[PDB]
Amino acid sequence: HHHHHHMVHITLDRNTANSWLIISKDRRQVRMGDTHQNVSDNKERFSNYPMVLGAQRFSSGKMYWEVDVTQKEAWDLGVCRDSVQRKGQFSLSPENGFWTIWLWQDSYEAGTSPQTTLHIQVPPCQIGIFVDYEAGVVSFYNITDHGSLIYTFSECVFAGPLRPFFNVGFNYSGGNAAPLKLCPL
Ligand SMILES: CC(C)C(=O)Nc1cccc(C(N)=O)c1
Numbered sequence: 001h002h003h004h005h006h007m008v009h010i011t012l013d014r015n016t017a018n019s020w021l022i023i024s025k026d027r028r029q030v031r032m033g034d035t036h037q038n039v040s041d042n043k044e045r046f047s048n049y050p051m052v053l054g055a056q057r058f059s060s061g062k063m064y065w066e067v068d069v070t071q072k073e074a075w076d077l078g079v080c081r082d083s084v085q086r087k088g089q090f091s092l093s094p095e096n097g098f099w100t101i102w103l104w105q106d107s108y109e110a111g112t113s114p115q116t117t118l119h120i121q122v123p124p125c126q127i128g129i130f131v132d133y134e135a136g137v138v139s140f141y142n143i144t145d146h147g148s149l150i151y152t153f154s155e156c157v158f159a160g161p162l163r164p165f166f167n168v169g170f171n172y173s174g175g176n177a178a179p180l181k182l183c184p185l
Contacts, residue, residue, distance in 0.1 A: 001147045002028030003130045007063040007185045010054045010164050016044045016086075017052040020170065027055070032171045047087045055080060063131045065164065066143060068181035069103070070125045075180060076102040077127055078111065079138055081160040082104030084156035099138040099153045100165060101127075110151045118151055126183055131162060
């Protein structure tokens with residue numbers, strides 16, 4: 001792909017984080033802690049899942065960023081509306097304001113309703129995410145496989161400002177402790 005010149009510097013918003021997440025000083029990495037991280041509760045925090053938002057809000061233009069997923073067993077990545085539900089149980093779908101892909105149990109899937117099987121021959125260590133606000137497009141790229149396309153959501157109805165979206169996943173297995181990292185430009 002040729003989207004690299006739309007690169008944006010994403011940072012994580014501590015206030016939106018599930019209370020078990022540990023965000024690095026530079027706000028560029030996040031991992032699951034083994035306990036509550038001693039923060040107060042607030043209406044922005046995702047309560048049920050290990051999720052956090054980027055601080056940046058997008059309402060126009062073309063944006064690109066990259067995320068490192070090395071050695072993780074489970075994660076979700078993409079964008080979401082600023083006004084997505086934070087509390088309780090919900091599914092990741094465009095109807096609920098999410099445009100995402102994930103890894104779960106050795107398979108990759110796009111967060112459509114119902115979910116769509118992805119076809120990835122080279123398991124990615126870094127994911128590229130491209131948003132074209134005006135066109136209504138969110139695309140995902142396999143940086144480990146020379147930028148090959150993973151999935152395109154088209155005809156997106158964003159219906160609000162967008163934020164970068166992250167889920168580090170649970171670590172019930174002891175094999176999913178590794179962080180998500182925002183990769184340098
Ligand atoms: C920051 C203060 C003013 C607040 O709102 N707290 C709070 C904490 C947990 C749940 C809720 C809630 N869901 O009402 C509200």
